[PDB]
Protein: Sialin
Amino acid sequence: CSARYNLAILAFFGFFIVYALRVNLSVALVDMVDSTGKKYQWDAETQGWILGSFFYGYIITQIPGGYVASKIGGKMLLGFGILGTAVLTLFTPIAADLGVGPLIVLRALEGLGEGVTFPAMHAMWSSWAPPLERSKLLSISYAGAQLGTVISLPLSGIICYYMNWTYVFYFFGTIGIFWFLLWIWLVSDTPQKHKRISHYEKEYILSSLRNQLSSQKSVPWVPILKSLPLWAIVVAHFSYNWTFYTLLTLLPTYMKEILRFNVQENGFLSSLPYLGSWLCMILSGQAADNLRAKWNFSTLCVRRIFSLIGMIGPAVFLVAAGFIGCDYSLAVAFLTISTTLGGFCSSGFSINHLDIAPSYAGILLGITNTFATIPGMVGPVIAKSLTPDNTVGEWQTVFYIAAAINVFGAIFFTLFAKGEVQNWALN
Structure:
């Protein structure tokens, strides 16, 4: 269609692929370990490190990704940060035969690759997206990643059921490389440096970003960010990402050990949770817009209410999913509802970083994403070391810990939550 919307679609597919490369192992590992290709003997804790080293790689280069993106643009950064991942995924089946050390190193490198995508997309959209249309563009560019998580579980399940897991890794690596070719050929870095853009579209984009940049003054100097509300956002994001990443990296293992499912239905009914989460995030954005339009609530009561809902609903329904274990339908239903009630939190709290200190979105997002990726490094290891032999009580321990963390994060956020400005964001 247009030029900025063509860039959206190519970023949509890019983030789809990056989340695919993040979760394909989360399925291929439950079809990989030994209790038809090769099946290694990993001692119920090696799987924790293999699942959660990608997030070491992610947290290493979250913020330096933002710096390098502001420096040398976004196109090459995102393209190479997805190509590195979709090339190391081509070698994951080869690095598995070498052992475990090489596999953890390969996933740390994949985390290095995938930690630089969003900080580059934000620069590309600071150069492309007109202010009065930034919302739809970012919405598409990240619904890409959401649909990646939603669809990457069924495809991994199917390819692990009818074929091996090496085929999962080869298929996702090949799709990654094909999209990287499309993304080097089509997308450019800035409407000025675009090859086949039209005059009127470039003039529209530039005449809107003219105001956007001219209204910016606090860009060069960076202050200290030791304010209380920022640590509230950080603690809430940490307590939400704990549950999110624990589920992301240990839902197929759960459905194959406790609930005693297949691998195909494992993929399908492991995807359904995130499909619900995505639909709920969309509907929750709509409901938040409506509730802030018709009623005021000082723009902060809505934040704390949506955080309470989207962080306690998951906790209580996760305790429920843990309580009634070893049951086919009710357990997966409670899990689906528990992670479906996360869209409330997602929208009505991850927009609090925009509302607390605008024009500083990148900085605050960088300070939040690392301290909420920490769960990616800890959670899987802890939840696989607490349950060496899968029993309903062993997994109830994990679910209880996750729900308690959710409740604590919700309390800590709704307590010290501010929403107008913190006296260091004014230009």
